[PDB]
Each structure stands twice: as C-alpha cells, then as structure tokens.
Ligand binder design. Sequence first.
Ligand SMILES: Cc1cn([C@H]2C[C@H](OP(=O)(O)O)[C@@H](COP(=O)(O)O)O2)c(=O)[nH]c1=O
Length: 129
Amino acid sequence: LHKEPATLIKAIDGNTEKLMYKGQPMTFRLLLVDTPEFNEKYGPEASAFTKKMVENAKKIEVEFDKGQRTDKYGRGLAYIYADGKMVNEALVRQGLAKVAYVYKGNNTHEQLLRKAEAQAKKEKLNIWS
Ligand SMILES: Cc1cn([C@H]2C[C@H](OP(=O)(O)O)[C@@H](COP(=O)(O)O)O2)c(=O)[nH]c1=O
C-alpha cells in the first residue's frame, strides 16, 4: 500500500472526514472501524478525538487498500494518517472504535487493528470500560 497526500477540509466525526484528495473534495469513510454515533455513548468523545488528531496534524495522508476505493454512498474508503499516525488504529487503540466492516480484499491492516482492540479491551478503555 501507498500513502498519498490530502488536506483536511472539515472534520465530521469518528467514522468520516471531508478531505481534499487529488484536488477534489471527498468524504472519507475510515476502513475497518466503527465508532459510536454522536447520540451514542462515547460518540462525542470519538468525534472530538478524531477532530483533534486531524486538525492538529501538519500532514494528512490517505492510504487505499487493494479493493474497492469508494463505497455505495460515494465515500472514499481508506486508512487516514495524521503526521504518520493512523487515525483508524488510534481510535481502536483508545477504545473509541471497534474493528468492524472487515471485507475480503480491503483488509490489509485487520490484524494490526485487532491487536489495538485487544490492548484497549485489556486496559478497559472507554467503550471497553
Ligand atoms: C466501512 C465500510 C462501510 N460500508 C458501508 C456498509 C454500511 O452499509 P449500510 O449504510 O447499508 O449500513 C455502511 C455503514 O457505514 P457507517 O458506519 O458510516 O453508517 O457503510 C462499506 O460498504 N464498506 C466499508 O468498508
């Protein structure tokens, strides 16, 4: 896989961000994760954590997996990095998301994220408390 450049347009929530990619605005849906919705327990905390991570970053990058690059809503499906740190992995590692939506052929970082989830659960963090 390869990291490519993008710039933040707007933080949305834990699950999605508006980024400029190849010069066009897109909504990105993070691969392999599901955060609680804003109304749900830890939803506001997941959005805040994401917002801070991507707004404070000097450099945003997107990393497509091997499979489909857009979902049925036209959302880009990627791993997002903020100053080299994966936002997908970070949410999971903090117990602010669960590993989810693992489809065959777009699952390169599945085991990395499942290890993060094991650690968050062992530490009883947030959703795992
Ligand atoms: C994360 C992801 C979601 N989706 C679609 C599946 C779900 O369909 P449905 O909308 O029919 O439930 C939807 C959930 O995304 P959200 O968690 O953002 O609501 O996103 C994909 O198709 N591929 C993906 O990799």
